[PDB]
Short mmCIF file of C-alpha atoms in Angstrom, two decimals:
data_model
loop_
_atom_site.label_atom_id
_atom_site.label_comp_id
_atom_site.label_asym_id
_atom_site.label_seq_id
_atom_site.Cartn_x
_atom_site.Cartn_y
_atom_site.Cartn_z
CA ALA A 1 99.63 -49.81 -118.23
CA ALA A 2 102.27 -51.05 -115.67
CA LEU A 3 100.24 -49.99 -113.11
CA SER A 4 96.91 -50.82 -113.46
CA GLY A 5 94.90 -52.31 -111.81
CA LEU A 6 98.18 -52.65 -108.86
CA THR A 7 97.90 -52.03 -105.76
CA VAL A 8 100.14 -52.18 -102.22
CA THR A 9 98.83 -52.93 -99.09
CA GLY A 10 100.79 -53.69 -95.80
CA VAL A 11 100.30 -57.77 -94.10
CA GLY A 12 103.06 -57.72 -91.66
CA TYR A 13 106.10 -56.65 -89.66
CA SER A 14 108.64 -57.66 -86.84
CA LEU A 15 110.42 -56.00 -84.47
CA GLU A 16 113.55 -56.12 -82.68
CA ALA A 17 113.22 -56.79 -79.16
CA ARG A 18 116.09 -56.99 -76.73
CA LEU A 19 115.93 -57.41 -72.76
CA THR A 20 117.87 -55.28 -70.04
CA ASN A 21 118.68 -58.23 -67.80
CA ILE A 22 118.44 -56.21 -65.11
CA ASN A 23 118.31 -59.81 -62.77
CA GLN A 24 119.50 -62.09 -65.09
CA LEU A 25 117.90 -64.87 -66.07
CA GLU A 26 119.88 -65.53 -69.70
CA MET A 27 122.95 -67.99 -69.21
CA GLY A 28 124.97 -67.96 -73.79
CA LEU A 29 127.35 -69.76 -73.08
CA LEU A 30 130.58 -70.53 -70.60
CA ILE A 31 134.52 -69.49 -71.15
CA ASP A 32 136.93 -72.01 -69.10
CA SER A 33 140.50 -71.64 -68.57
CA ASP A 34 143.05 -74.63 -68.86
CA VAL A 35 146.91 -74.59 -68.56
CA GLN A 36 148.87 -77.73 -70.57
CA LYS A 37 152.45 -77.58 -69.64
CA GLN A 38 154.92 -79.04 -71.08
CA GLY A 39 158.93 -79.79 -69.42
CA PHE A 40 161.97 -79.15 -71.02
CA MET A 41 165.41 -80.77 -70.47
CA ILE A 42 168.84 -79.36 -71.61
CA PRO A 43 171.13 -82.04 -72.11
CA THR A 44 175.16 -82.82 -72.12
CA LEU A 45 177.68 -83.30 -75.29
CA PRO A 46 180.16 -85.07 -75.44
CA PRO A 47 183.55 -83.66 -74.43
CA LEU A 48 186.30 -81.79 -76.02
CA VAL A 49 189.96 -82.56 -75.26
CA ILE A 50 193.28 -81.09 -75.25
CA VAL A 51 196.44 -82.23 -74.67
CA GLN B 1 116.90 -66.88 -59.73
CA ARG B 2 115.83 -63.18 -59.70
CA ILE B 3 118.15 -60.93 -57.53
CA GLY B 4 116.44 -58.18 -55.91
CA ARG B 5 116.78 -56.28 -52.97
CA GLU B 6 113.60 -56.26 -49.99
CA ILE B 7 112.73 -54.23 -46.77
CA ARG B 8 110.12 -55.96 -44.94
CA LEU B 9 107.76 -54.48 -42.40
CA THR B 10 106.44 -56.88 -40.27
CA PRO B 11 103.52 -55.22 -38.24
CA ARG B 12 101.82 -56.62 -35.17
CA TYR B 13 98.41 -56.13 -33.57
CA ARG B 14 94.67 -56.38 -33.35
CA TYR B 15 92.03 -54.87 -30.96
CA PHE B 16 89.96 -56.56 -27.91
CA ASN B 17 86.31 -55.49 -27.28
CA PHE B 18 85.11 -55.58 -23.58
CA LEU B 19 82.12 -53.28 -22.69
CA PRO B 20 78.97 -54.95 -24.29
CA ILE B 21 77.11 -51.67 -24.27
CA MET B 22 76.64 -49.41 -27.66
CA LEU B 23 74.47 -47.09 -28.39
CA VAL B 24 74.04 -45.95 -33.05
CA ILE B 25 72.00 -42.95 -34.54
CA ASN B 26 71.65 -43.13 -38.20
CA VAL B 27 70.78 -39.98 -39.97
CA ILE B 28 69.20 -39.10 -43.92
CA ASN B 29 68.19 -37.03 -45.95
CA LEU B 30 70.08 -35.04 -44.59
CA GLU B 31 70.68 -32.67 -48.11
CA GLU B 32 66.61 -32.93 -48.95
CA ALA B 33 65.97 -30.59 -45.84
CA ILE B 34 68.51 -27.46 -46.23
CA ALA B 35 67.39 -27.88 -50.02
CA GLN B 36 63.73 -28.26 -50.26
CA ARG B 37 61.40 -26.38 -49.59
CA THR B 38 61.27 -27.21 -45.49
CA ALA B 39 57.75 -25.06 -43.48
CA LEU B 40 55.49 -25.25 -40.67
CA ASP B 41 55.04 -29.56 -40.72
CA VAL B 42 51.19 -27.60 -39.86
CA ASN B 43 49.04 -30.69 -38.73
CA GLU B 44 45.75 -29.24 -39.68
CA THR B 45 44.10 -31.05 -36.54
CA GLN B 46 39.92 -32.60 -36.90
CA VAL B 47 38.25 -29.10 -35.56
CA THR B 48 36.51 -28.59 -39.03
CA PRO B 49 33.63 -31.29 -39.12
CA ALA B 50 34.97 -34.09 -40.51
CA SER B 51 35.30 -36.30 -37.14
#
């Protein structure tokens, strides 16, 4: 009853395709290197004394 | 922006013509003569009354 007059038919599809790029034509994202560098200091402190 | 390695050959030559004398003979129908009935092409010559 549920499958009476029921037909299945193929319509479409897709492909998982990708290029080797032996010669390269694409770039994609880039990467950069930067250095942010800070200096640190050594104080002095008030002295101690003995008599 | 395609990277490939190429090997190139550079030809150089030319033909010249000096003697203004030349002959051509043309042959046709060679296969038929061996293939077909070949025999004396008897040119029956008019010494039976027709002339």
